């Protein structure tokens with residue numbers, strides 16, 4: 001209606017039902033839009049984000065749509081806190097989901113999680129869009145067990161310098177290739193690297209990558225050409241796929257299209 005562009009949701013259309021989580025970015029709530037449609041309402045913590053930049057980016061992000069990418073529905077920008085309105089993912093964080101041993105996952109399910117993410121990432125790569133912080137903690141799981149990629153690109157707007165710089169205490173060192181750690185070279189291939197780590201996290205049922213190392217030690221390990229090694233649940237073929245993401249030379253890492261092809265081949269051969 002009047003006073004709300006195509007990217008703007010009227011927050012008066014929201015019904016708040018349950019709190020989903022709280023952290024440094026703000027608070028996520030489960031709710032309804034116009035009494036009917038499930039949504040997540042992501043409430044941006046005041047002072048945490050470069051808000052005008054985020055809002056301008058949100059307008060572009062409205063055009064991104066893929067069944068394995070958490071759908072952005074709009075933003076609420078007229079009051080503080082700012083709201084991001086997205087698709088609701090009832091089973092929450094992938095990292096926590098993986099760590100719940102009750103699921104007793106088959107490896108076919110683990111590969112399907114990898115495929116879900118790979119499809120979303122191929123889509124983002126086709127649009128020349130980087131995630132910039134791909135990891136199990138930034139994937140979500142819906143009521144049907146489908147994994148979708150969440151908060152893609154959000155790190156560009158985070159004001160906490162501990163998060164954003166390669167030498168910061170909250171920087172995703174364990175998901176970063178040597179060229180990121182050494183000289184902040186972000187590219188498609190740093191997303192590829194992170195995706196390999198994410199496959200590792202999935203097959204490890206949510207273990208911390210390099211769990212016995214600090215971030216500093218991890219950076220040294222990977223600068224010396226050393227790597228994560230094969231999760232017990234990963235077949236040789238699955239391990240080959242994740243390991244291909246970790247070539248020292250960024251140009252020798254696959255694309256998401258190639259990874260997707262590889263994953264599908266393994267599903268045909270093994271699942």
Ligand SMILES: CNC(=O)[C@H]1Cc2c([nH]c3ccccc23)CN1C(=O)c1occc1CNc1ccc2nccnc2c1
Nearest residue numbers: 020021022023024025026027040042043044088089092093
């Ligand atoms: C560092 N972390 C955070 O500060 C909070 C708040 C938040 C996040 N991202 C933001 C972006 C903009 C504004 C505030 C935030 C991430 N975060 C979470 O609690 C969170 O992270 C993963 C899962 C959860 C909580 N559970 C769910 C469950 C179902 C969902 N469905 C759809 C969408 N998000 C869901 C979250």
